[PDB]
Design an enzyme around this catalytic site. Structure first.
Site, PDB file in Angstrom:
ATOM      1  N   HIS A  61       2.230  42.176 101.125  1.00 25.83           N
ATOM      2  CA  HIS A  61       3.207  42.822 102.048  1.00 25.83           C
ATOM      3  C   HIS A  61       4.663  42.574 101.634  1.00 25.83           C
ATOM      4  O   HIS A  61       5.555  43.192 102.164  1.00 25.83           O
ATOM      5  CB  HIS A  61       3.000  42.495 103.544  1.00 25.83           C
ATOM      6  CG  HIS A  61       2.899  41.047 103.905  1.00 25.83           C
ATOM      7  ND1 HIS A  61       1.707  40.385 103.806  1.00 25.83           N
ATOM      8  CD2 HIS A  61       3.779  40.184 104.490  1.00 25.83           C
ATOM      9  CE1 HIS A  61       1.854  39.146 104.203  1.00 25.83           C
ATOM     10  NE2 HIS A  61       3.113  38.971 104.706  1.00 25.83           N
ATOM     11  N   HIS A  91      11.982  36.008 100.841  1.00 34.50           N
ATOM     12  CA  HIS A  91      11.336  37.274 100.523  1.00 34.50           C
ATOM     13  C   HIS A  91      12.240  38.394 100.998  1.00 34.50           C
ATOM     14  O   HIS A  91      13.277  38.136 101.607  1.00 34.50           O
ATOM     15  CB  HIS A  91       9.958  37.361 101.205  1.00 34.50           C
ATOM     16  CG  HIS A  91      10.050  37.382 102.706  1.00 34.50           C
ATOM     17  ND1 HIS A  91      10.121  36.236 103.436  1.00 34.50           N
ATOM     18  CD2 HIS A  91      10.202  38.410 103.588  1.00 34.50           C
ATOM     19  CE1 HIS A  91      10.285  36.526 104.716  1.00 34.50           C
ATOM     20  NE2 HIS A  91      10.350  37.880 104.842  1.00 34.50           N
ATOM     21  N   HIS A  93      12.527  42.741 102.440  1.00 33.19           N
ATOM     22  CA  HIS A  93      12.013  43.947 103.041  1.00 33.19           C
ATOM     23  C   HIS A  93      12.865  45.085 102.481  1.00 33.19           C
ATOM     24  O   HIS A  93      14.083  44.936 102.441  1.00 33.19           O
ATOM     25  CB  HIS A  93      12.072  43.892 104.580  1.00 33.19           C
ATOM     26  CG  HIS A  93      11.367  42.721 105.177  1.00 33.19           C
ATOM     27  ND1 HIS A  93      10.023  42.741 105.489  1.00 33.19           N
ATOM     28  CD2 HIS A  93      11.843  41.457 105.344  1.00 33.19           C
ATOM     29  CE1 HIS A  93       9.693  41.514 105.922  1.00 33.19           C
ATOM     30  NE2 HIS A  93      10.812  40.711 105.853  1.00 33.19           N
ATOM     31  N   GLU A 103      15.231  45.375 108.439  1.00 36.40           N
ATOM     32  CA  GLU A 103      14.568  45.153 109.712  1.00 36.40           C
ATOM     33  C   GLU A 103      15.603  45.124 110.836  1.00 36.40           C
ATOM     34  O   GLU A 103      15.546  45.947 111.746  1.00 36.40           O
ATOM     35  CB  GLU A 103      13.777  43.855 109.566  1.00 36.40           C
ATOM     36  CG  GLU A 103      12.744  43.886 108.456  1.00 36.40           C
ATOM     37  CD  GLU A 103      11.506  43.073 108.737  1.00 36.40           C
ATOM     38  OE1 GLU A 103      11.590  41.826 108.761  1.00 36.40           O
ATOM     39  OE2 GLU A 103      10.433  43.677 108.893  1.00 36.40           O
ATOM     40  N   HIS A 116      15.319  37.517 103.591  1.00 35.04           N
ATOM     41  CA  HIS A 116      15.044  36.452 104.544  1.00 35.04           C
ATOM     42  C   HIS A 116      14.760  35.120 103.850  1.00 35.04           C
ATOM     43  O   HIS A 116      13.801  35.002 103.085  1.00 35.04           O
ATOM     44  CB  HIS A 116      13.828  36.841 105.373  1.00 35.04           C
ATOM     45  CG  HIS A 116      14.031  37.991 106.293  1.00 35.04           C
ATOM     46  ND1 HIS A 116      13.005  38.739 106.835  1.00 35.04           N
ATOM     47  CD2 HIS A 116      15.186  38.560 106.701  1.00 35.04           C
ATOM     48  CE1 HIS A 116      13.545  39.678 107.610  1.00 35.04           C
ATOM     49  NE2 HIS A 116      14.872  39.584 107.554  1.00 35.04           N
ATOM     50  N   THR A 195       8.614  38.748 111.975  1.00 35.76           N
ATOM     51  CA  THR A 195       8.626  40.203 111.965  1.00 35.76           C
ATOM     52  C   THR A 195       7.346  40.785 111.359  1.00 35.76           C
ATOM     53  O   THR A 195       7.204  42.029 111.349  1.00 35.76           O
ATOM     54  CB  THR A 195       9.838  40.793 111.227  1.00 35.76           C
ATOM     55  OG1 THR A 195       9.687  40.433 109.858  1.00 35.76           O
ATOM     56  CG2 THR A 195      11.183  40.361 111.799  1.00 35.76           C
ATOM     57  N   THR A 196       6.411  39.910 110.942  1.00 39.24           N
ATOM     58  CA  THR A 196       5.066  40.296 110.521  1.00 39.24           C
ATOM     59  C   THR A 196       4.054  39.569 111.387  1.00 39.24           C
ATOM     60  O   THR A 196       4.335  38.461 111.881  1.00 39.24           O
ATOM     61  CB  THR A 196       4.775  39.921 109.055  1.00 39.24           C
ATOM     62  OG1 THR A 196       5.189  38.568 108.820  1.00 39.24           O
ATOM     63  CG2 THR A 196       5.543  40.843 108.146  1.00 39.24           C
TER      64      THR A 196
HETATM   65  C1  LIG Z   1       3.393  37.779 105.536  1.00 42.91           C
HETATM   66  C2  LIG Z   1       3.998  36.476 105.001  1.00 42.91           C
HETATM   67  S1  LIG Z   1       5.475  36.687 104.255  1.00 42.91           S
HETATM   68  O1  LIG Z   1       5.690  37.838 103.424  1.00 42.91           O
HETATM   69  O2  LIG Z   1       5.622  35.464 103.459  1.00 42.91           O
HETATM   70  C3  LIG Z   1       6.581  36.631 105.444  1.00 42.91           C
HETATM   71  C4  LIG Z   1       7.183  37.912 105.894  1.00 42.91           C
HETATM   72  F1  LIG Z   1       6.814  39.078 105.371  1.00 42.91           F
HETATM   73  C5  LIG Z   1       8.215  37.944 106.933  1.00 42.91           C
HETATM   74  F2  LIG Z   1       8.701  39.128 107.262  1.00 42.91           F
HETATM   75  C6  LIG Z   1       8.644  36.718 107.634  1.00 42.91           C
HETATM   76  S2  LIG Z   1       9.947  36.829 108.604  1.00 42.91           S
HETATM   77  N1  LIG Z   1      10.697  38.207 108.466  1.00 42.91           N
HETATM   78  O3  LIG Z   1       9.554  36.681 109.966  1.00 42.91           O
HETATM   79  O4  LIG Z   1      10.835  35.776 108.205  1.00 42.91           O
HETATM   80  C7  LIG Z   1       8.127  35.422 107.146  1.00 42.91           C
HETATM   81  F3  LIG Z   1       8.560  34.310 107.726  1.00 42.91           F
HETATM   82  C8  LIG Z   1       7.051  35.364 106.121  1.00 42.91           C
HETATM   83  N2  LIG Z   1       6.523  34.195 105.698  1.00 42.91           N
HETATM   84  C9  LIG Z   1       6.443  32.960 106.444  1.00 42.91           C
HETATM   85  C10 LIG Z   1       6.077  31.843 105.463  1.00 42.91           C
HETATM   86  C11 LIG Z   1       6.861  30.554 105.676  1.00 42.91           C
HETATM   87  C12 LIG Z   1       6.064  29.500 106.448  1.00 42.91           C
HETATM   88  C13 LIG Z   1       6.038  29.764 107.945  1.00 42.91           C
HETATM   89  C14 LIG Z   1       4.928  30.741 108.319  1.00 42.91           C
HETATM   90  C15 LIG Z   1       5.502  32.123 108.629  1.00 42.91           C
HETATM   91  C16 LIG Z   1       5.337  33.113 107.477  1.00 42.91           C
HETATM   92 ZN   LIG Z   2      10.994  38.777 106.555  1.00 40.47          ZN
END
Ligand SMILES: *CCS(=O)(=O)c1c(F)c(F)c(S(N)(=O)=O)c(F)c1NC1CCCCCCC1
Ligand SMILES: [Zn+2]
Length: 257
Positions: A61, A91, A93, A103, A116, A195-196
């Site tokens: 994703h 990561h 978006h 987002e 992010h 946001t996921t």
């Molecule tokens: C689907 C996991 S991800 O890509 O690592 C991920 C993501 F797509 C996100 F959009 C968020 S966000 N926007 O809410 O910051 C995110 F935090 C992601 N990963 C974290 C990993 C860090 C450890 C804490 C567990 C939450 C998922």
């Molecule tokens: Zn994110």
């Protein structure tokens, strides 16, 4: 499973994750005229000199650059935050075209992408415990607009062809995330969520006002990644963003007058 496709996108997530319609969901629109300056906020403290990157991963994703978070090496403190938050990964978006991808929005404006930088509250010991807490995570959000190239992004862009498909990873050491920051750390802040899926309501959001500029060619290479795994039909990894969610009983605060 969930994704950003024609049939499993954000409008479907509530069926497996009812918190999708909760009271503190992210992202949101930032109405610049309604956000109130809060002279009690402190300046952000971003301490990344000792950050140690390890690996870059296509997780299906997005792509993640993971850090060694076994020590307080790269931390976010100050601003709205109480205590110390440790960098675990960043990561992005992004969109299928330059007019969408972020987002968060600003007066309903969408940016081409959004970075992010994810940090966890060290008082909870590990990230798994942190995401169960209302103050468990701090996510620093940075808007990308298309213009001049960002030199500090190119090392990321150049490894993407090695992680094209879901489940691929590559060694990615000695990357300095300070090269992705804008000049100003002026910010908006509000309580929100991941946001996921699983959309946990565990995030203090810190969204910088100043966007960074990246080149068309840089963002075009993000759009060559794949949602699918190797050996499966190609689905370009594009439009991996959730739309703005209702603000409800929340105030967005500004660090600047
Ligand atoms: C689907 C996991 S991800 O890509 O690592 C991920 C993501 F797509 C996100 F959009 C968020 S966000 N926007 O809410 O910051 C995110 F935090 C992601 N990963 C974290 C990993 C860090 C450890 C804490 C567990 C939450 C998922
Ligand atoms: Zn994110």
């Amino acid at each position: 499973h969930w994704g950003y496709g024609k049939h499993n996108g954000p409008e479907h997530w509530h069926k497996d994750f009812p918190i999708a319609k909760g009271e503190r969901q992210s992202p949101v629109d930032i109405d610049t005229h309604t956000a109130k300056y809060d002279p009690s906020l402190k300046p952000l403290s971003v301490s990344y000199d000792q950050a140690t990157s390890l690996r870059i991963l296509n997780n299906g994703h997005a792509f993640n650059v993971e850090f060694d978070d076994s020590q307080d090496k790269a931390v976010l403190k100050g601003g709205p935050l109480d205590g110390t938050y440790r960098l675990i990964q960043f990561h992005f978006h992004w969109g299928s075209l330059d007019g969408q991808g972020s987002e968060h929005t600003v007066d309903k404006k969408k940016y081409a992408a959004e970075l992010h930088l994810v940090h966890w509250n060290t008082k909870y010991g590990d990230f798994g415990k942190a995401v169960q807490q209302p103050d468990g995570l701090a996510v620093l959000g940075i808007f990308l607009k298309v213009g001049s190239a960002k030199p500090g992004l190119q090392k990321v862009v150049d490894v993407l062809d090695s992680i094209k498909t879901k489940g691929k990873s590559a060694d990615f050491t000695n990357f300095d995330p300070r090269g992705l920051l804008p000049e100003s750390l002026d910010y908006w802040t509000y309580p929100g969520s991941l946001t996921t899926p699983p959309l946990l309501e565990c995030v203090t959001w810190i969204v910088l006002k100043e966007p960074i500029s990246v080149s068309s060619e840089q963002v075009l290479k993000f759009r060559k990644l794949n949602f699918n795994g190797e050996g499966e039909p190609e689905e370009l990894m594009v439009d991996n963003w959730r739309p703005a969610q209702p603000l409800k009983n929340r105030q967005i605060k500004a660090s600047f007058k």
